[PDB]
Design a protein around this ligand. Sequence first.
Ligand SMILES: Nc1nc2c(c(=O)[nH]1)N[C@H]1C(S)=C(S)[C@@H](COP(=O)(O)OP(=O)(O)OC[C@H]3O[C@@H](n4cnc5c(=O)[nH]c(N)nc54)[C@H](O)[C@@H]3O)O[C@H]1N2
Ligand SMILES: Nc1nc2c(c(=O)[nH]1)N[C@H]1C(S)=C(S)[C@@H](COP(=O)(O)OP(=O)(O)OC[C@H]3O[C@@H](n4cnc5c(=O)[nH]c(N)nc54)[C@H](O)[C@@H]3O)O[C@H]1N2
Ligand SMILES: Oc1c(Cl)c(Cl)c(Cl)c(Cl)c1Cl
Ligand SMILES: Oc1c(Cl)c(Cl)c(Cl)c(Cl)c1Cl
Ligand code: SF4
Ligand code: SF4
Ligand code: SF4
Ligand code: SF4
Ligand code: SF4
Ligand code: SF4
Ligand code: SF4
Ligand code: SF4
Ligand code: SF4
Ligand SMILES: [Mo]
Lengths: 250, 250, 734, 193, 193
Amino acid sequence: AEFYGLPNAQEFWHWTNALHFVLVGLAGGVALLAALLHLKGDAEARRYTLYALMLIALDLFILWAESPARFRFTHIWLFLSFHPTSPIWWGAWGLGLGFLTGGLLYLGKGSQRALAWALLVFSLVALSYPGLALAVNLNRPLWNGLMAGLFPLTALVLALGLAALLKSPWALFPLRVLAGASLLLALLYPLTLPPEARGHLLEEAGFWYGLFLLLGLGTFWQERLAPWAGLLAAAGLRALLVLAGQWQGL
Amino acid sequence: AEFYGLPNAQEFWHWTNALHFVLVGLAGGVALLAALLHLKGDAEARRYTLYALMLIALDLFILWAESPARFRFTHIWLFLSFHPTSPIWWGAWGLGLGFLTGGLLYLGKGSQRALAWALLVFSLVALSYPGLALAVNLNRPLWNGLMAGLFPLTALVLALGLAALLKSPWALFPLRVLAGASLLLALLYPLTLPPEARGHLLEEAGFWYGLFLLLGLGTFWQERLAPWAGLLAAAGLRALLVLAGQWQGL
Amino acid sequence: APWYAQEVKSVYQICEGCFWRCGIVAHAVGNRVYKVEGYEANPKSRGRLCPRGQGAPQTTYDPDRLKRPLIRVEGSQRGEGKYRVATWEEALDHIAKKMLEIREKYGPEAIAFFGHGTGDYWFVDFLPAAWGSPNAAKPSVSLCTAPREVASQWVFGRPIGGHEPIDWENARYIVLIGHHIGEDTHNTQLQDFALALKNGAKVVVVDPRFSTAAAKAHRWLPIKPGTDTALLLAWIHVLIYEDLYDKEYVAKYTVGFEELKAHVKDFTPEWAEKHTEIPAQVIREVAREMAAHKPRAVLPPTRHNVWYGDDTYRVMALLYVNVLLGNYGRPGGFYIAQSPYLEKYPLPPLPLEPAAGGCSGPSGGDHEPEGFKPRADKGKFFARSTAIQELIEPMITGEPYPIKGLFAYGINLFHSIPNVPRTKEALKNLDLYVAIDVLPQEHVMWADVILPEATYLERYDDFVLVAHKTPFIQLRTPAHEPLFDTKPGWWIARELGLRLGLEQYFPWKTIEEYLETRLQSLGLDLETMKGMGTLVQRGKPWLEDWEKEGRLPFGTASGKIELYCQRFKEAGHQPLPVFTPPEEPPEGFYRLLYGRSPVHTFARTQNNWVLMEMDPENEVWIHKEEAKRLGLKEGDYVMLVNQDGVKEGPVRVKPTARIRKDCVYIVHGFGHKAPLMRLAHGRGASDNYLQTRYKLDPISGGAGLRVNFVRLEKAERPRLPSLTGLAKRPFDER
Amino acid sequence: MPRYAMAIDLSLCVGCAACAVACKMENEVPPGVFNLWIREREVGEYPNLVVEFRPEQCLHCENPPCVPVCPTGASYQTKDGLVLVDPKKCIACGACIAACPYDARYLHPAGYVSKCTFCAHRLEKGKVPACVETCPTYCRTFGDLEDPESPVAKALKAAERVDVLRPEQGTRPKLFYLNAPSKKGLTRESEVH
Amino acid sequence: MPRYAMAIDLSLCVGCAACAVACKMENEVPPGVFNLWIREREVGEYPNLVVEFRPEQCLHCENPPCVPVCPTGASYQTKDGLVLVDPKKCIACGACIAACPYDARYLHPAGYVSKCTFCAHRLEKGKVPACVETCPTYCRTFGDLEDPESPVAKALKAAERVDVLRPEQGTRPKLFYLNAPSKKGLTRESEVH
Ligand SMILES: Nc1nc2c(c(=O)[nH]1)N[C@H]1C(S)=C(S)[C@@H](COP(=O)(O)OP(=O)(O)OC[C@H]3O[C@@H](n4cnc5c(=O)[nH]c(N)nc54)[C@H](O)[C@@H]3O)O[C@H]1N2
Ligand SMILES: Nc1nc2c(c(=O)[nH]1)N[C@H]1C(S)=C(S)[C@@H](COP(=O)(O)OP(=O)(O)OC[C@H]3O[C@@H](n4cnc5c(=O)[nH]c(N)nc54)[C@H](O)[C@@H]3O)O[C@H]1N2
Ligand SMILES: Oc1c(Cl)c(Cl)c(Cl)c(Cl)c1Cl
Ligand SMILES: Oc1c(Cl)c(Cl)c(Cl)c(Cl)c1Cl
Ligand code: SF4
Ligand code: SF4
Ligand code: SF4
Ligand code: SF4
Ligand code: SF4
Ligand code: SF4
Ligand code: SF4
Ligand code: SF4
Ligand code: SF4
Ligand SMILES: [Mo]
């Protein structure tokens, strides 16, 4: 209760790493739309493959931009070591090989639709890694097992929300299906925590939490409210869980 | 290491109950289908309501036929008290009221959209309570937070898989979206566990688990294998987590 | 539904759980004792009870418990299990008729009487002498306590007794040699040991195994087996040569202390460490520490002492150390135990009377010209106690005359006497073999006539007298009447006694008649005795109380420290030089050590569902590194094969270290081959079936058991019935 | 008004299941189940060999996870700190078994769930529990935690160390272990192999 | 090949912060961050007041959650049991800070993660850490756990009790608190509120 000096219990991932969390949701989700649109033969497979390349690249820039290690150029090691136990490592390659693969697909060469299978795999790695980068830390009570489920569900709500605003006919229905799955797990999450972890969550966020749950109920009303309301709900929850879970707490 | 007598650490939920677990998934998810159908004003809303009623009846019958207190007639207390903190209490009231609500819908009595929204809410209570009946036991390392995510999504793969065998046209696409979600979260599940618990899941199960993960992949292949494969993966996964997670273990 | 909400009837009752005989209250509701409890005034239980005492009542409500007399179908072999129900009248006639025939062509000494438990007074002490056979014995003498009783009779003039006289509450330093307290679960001594620990009593344990008592010790000396006398001699040497002993005490109460100092000249902590394997510094430190605490430092003598053939020497040496510390009769470790006064029931002297020997000719003087035929083991060892294991040979060869006919009153022939094959040959050759018991054990079903005894809760027994700081008398009253066709042992004895001309012995027509006579003597009657279950009398415990009166206790007027002028003379040696290096296990083998499970009594509790459910099997203790070289792990099973090829049913392996690499350990009493005791049948390994050989103590009739070696052979897990299934069979008093 | 508890001295416990058998008898606990059992574990090699004997049974947790999870209201916590079951409401759903972190409860064959009762039947008539009365070593103590005179209160006051099983669940057990034999505390299966 | 460890005898720690200041001077740890800090907590009420002075720092866990989590490989565990950071490969992502259960890790203002180092720089020249060196109360010891002549080894042997922070986690902390002042062990915030 009293200290000489202080434990390094200060926030470590700030509002900027909460912003990247939201974009890699999009980047991975859209890369999934793209490969599926390929595999399916759809005329739109190209439009969505060059978007995913921008979203992926925007994120990888925000990832280096927000790193205090940027002008020390140490990221080359992210690609010169084998580290399968590391969620973040898996996301470096998943977004890196996912980029090349999406390049060799947009420049119609190298190979076709055997390459959409590789894009599908790399997009699943990119959709999976954040969720596990949090849940892997078993010392953080709030970042429980549900993060591994709440993040991939929420990244597809982001990708389908975007897709539906760029008026693609197919996007609304699956966005309202994954948004229902997303919102129901988000409601059950608090009931899954131990009492002190939940109490911490409701005093720190919550309103904010119960706001984004309410806001998300807007995907099931009108259009041009729908993709917006589900999009703000998915990014709300994503950013708030990264911000409120950096607690170690007893 | 050695005992005089023994701790009561034996399986408390049998193959019998695991069956109840697969069934309440079906029951709840078909009651969601009937609710959403009445809500679109679609013609099939009537027989889906009969089915959700049948599966609700079949599930309450085996919840009672498998109870050691089946002839002591004490289930009446489930209904004469208020226990909001208990998943099984929520489950009893959701199904129960969901069976009256769906009873009046079938008999065109006591209103009809206001009864379809009710069926919607009670079918969300029934889809939600199983994963929480597991997940609230923070002493059991395998029943972590993801159980609150794995159980609702898997109950949907069961209902939609059934709807598609009955040849309803709308469902073979949602079945593939929801089966992709369920299999992705099911694959990341073991990676969400402390080492010793993952090692325990792998020793005791897995090979069954890994077989259920492969199986479910056939939901994206041949048209009429797709619902069987999706049904068996979702039911195998639910029963395996129920039997393998009854461990306190240090 | 609960028993305590239902109407109850209590009674003051003794526990027959084991021979400690704790005073208990039994709570019955109708014909069934639901609960039993210790009681405060009783000096043994004082309100508490061990596990065996608590579970002891279920044998009375065991569906396999013996109910009717039975006689062996004519023409069927003993062993084969063919019987036909009989009447008490018919079975009792058949026994007397047969007994009388053996007596007309052989004499009455051709009938051996083996027995144990409370009613052994009738079968082993009374009936045999009233009938005229000196061949009466109990396993608690040559298979337990003989070495120390003999050592004690020679050194002090007293026994150590059934309630060993240790003043635990004032003890300050305690040395346990093989004495496992906490596994050996005798009530009061558990209580006392626990109270000593509690008050800051530091305990040293000497044992090749890290036992429960060692788990509570300040020092554990992992001694090489069969080597304790070298450690005792070297401690005797340190207290004499470093001049730490109690000088006065030896000067006023000790004879021949000088012979001991010279004997022990070369037995130094360095000579000891060589055989003992305990470092010489440790040997020294332990003797100094105990000298620093006198007279409140004690080496209490253990109860089971047959370990090796030399045994009386080890105990003598342990007693010298206690004497040298000045603790006997002083508060610290030995109070002086006097027997209570309850006058015997008036009767004519018995044809044969006993000789509680110790000095000046207690061997065979009365056995040579004195009337007609001495106990059949008369020339085999020095001491005068009857040895159960030596009178078995006479039944096979007819050597020392012939013993046809044998009685087994509650004594496990196949688990308590070594060399089971030899005992079976001996039953083969008998003309009559009767067994009085409750359960259908493997040795009861080899009998011509089985008589079902009534259990301790459905029975009255002659009083239980306990020599103690404050001597006392206990009385057990039925909690309810016998079940089925069951009869008390006092009744069975009297009924046989009237049939063989012994009416002058057995005159009284009933046990309460008998009990009223002894209560007259003391100043009470039956109803008042039932009122205060136990009776405490005044006695003495120190030396002052004795001394001020101008007397001392002993044997001959001064404890003789080397300890016995008449053995010297005609036997050979007086002192305990027989540290006698022990024969070692052959390579590939281990010494077989054995002991108690806190929850099971000897062998008789293996069919008890309340107790088997706490401990359903034994487990072989091997050092972690040996089980590893062998290819054995945690849940494996194994057969134990002894140096003579005998294999003992599959036992679980227990690779956890708390034992030397020289040894292996298993709890005694498992391995029953008795199909009718449905939950004890086929479980664990029997130590006795592996104890094929034994080294006869030439001084105290004892059969050294720790002389057997065993090796382990990988075996399959056993397939056995479900214990819960069997335990659930309802008890029907028909 | 009291807050009921139990204290067991492990420095004195020798693992003779006396308490376990006394409870079996006093409470008529059927064959395949147990309200009380003893666990025995060794720790270490030759020159530092410790053995821990440990009775385990309902700890009558102050914050019992085994109560909120019950659908009927059969599972309840008393005003003095006893966790009990009203068999009249019990549906034998096993929710309380899933929730107890100590393997303290079982399905009794009569159709309802059972477990250590702190001998409520004896407590009500002013007696001490069966385990507490039959105990050669005098290592268990019982009483009102709030009364400075009660035997548990005294026992805790005189203890060198106090431990509780799985303290990190947050159940607040009311069965205290005194003076554990091992320096590192109560033994766990995880600190083995 | 040895197993490096630190032991702190809390019966002697007075929480003066000498070790903490000796560390800051030696490793020139920058303002605002700490390799080592002291935590002081009272467990209360008059006749029974207890104060725990507890220095905290990297425990150099034997099974460190901060190593596996690193994408770069800059977080490595050494052959003798030191967890160190090679700043050449560090991308300052914080994954290790997220996985550290003890708050022992910080972002150095020079753009890489830092934390106590077991004074690696001194261990190679054959010296004892700076905090161990300055300690006025002689309460902290160090050495190879496997060498029984080690000051850690001898102290662990002499301790009345040995504890570790969050044992329930996977880690196997190699910083041992010896004689904890409160009977219930090391103080926790949940045990207050
Ligand atoms: N191999 C080996 N032998 C030993 C020992 C050992 O450790 N190993 N220990 C030795 C020692 S120390 C002792 S003291 C003795 C004890 O030896 P025993 O007393 O012979 O041992 P138990 O195995 O209990 O056998 C008791 C027999 O009496 C029966 N019985 C029990 N209660 C009653 C009753 O009320 N009435 C009647 N009629 N019968 C009853 C039981 O069914 C069983 O047949 O054994 C000794 N023998
Ligand atoms: N639970 C229970 N308790 C009982 C009984 C029972 O049947 N059940 N029976 C009672 C009776 S009658 C008796 S006789 C006793 C038996 O019990 P004890 O009288 O205590 O027997 P001991 O043979 O002294 O002790 C057994 C210990 O002796 C050890 N030992 C073996 N060889 C040697 C050696 O060479 N040197 C040393 N120092 N130790 C050695 C073994 O390792 C074991 O740890 O217990 C009594 N109490
Ligand atoms: O979900 C339930 C479960 Cl698992 C059980 Cl065991 C019971 Cl009894 C009931 Cl009623 C429900 Cl709803
Ligand atoms: O996902 C990432 C996160 Cl969260 C950080 Cl902080 C960094 Cl530096 C990088 Cl490279 C990736 Cl990929
Ligand atoms: S010591 Fe135990 S088993 Fe023996 S008589 Fe006493 S209570 Fe019964
Ligand atoms: S009765 Fe006493 S010694 Fe026996 S298990 Fe219980 S607490 Fe331990
Ligand atoms: S099994 Fe009985 S006591 Fe337990 S939660 Fe169910 S109804 Fe309640
Ligand atoms: S010990 Fe078991 S029964 Fe008692 S409160 Fe805790 S979880 Fe409930
Ligand atoms: S307190 Fe009651 S329930 Fe607990 S062990 Fe004792 S008798 Fe059994
Ligand atoms: S030198 Fe000792 S007392 Fe001072 S802060 Fe460091 S550990 Fe604490
Ligand atoms: S901050 Fe540096 S040491 Fe820590 S995980 Fe990232 S790259 Fe590894
Ligand atoms: S205490 Fe934390 S930072 Fe230090 S080695 Fe252990 S897990 Fe890593
Ligand atoms: S070992 Fe070195 S770096 Fe660690 S706290 Fe001590 S002085 Fe600081
Ligand atoms: Mo004995």
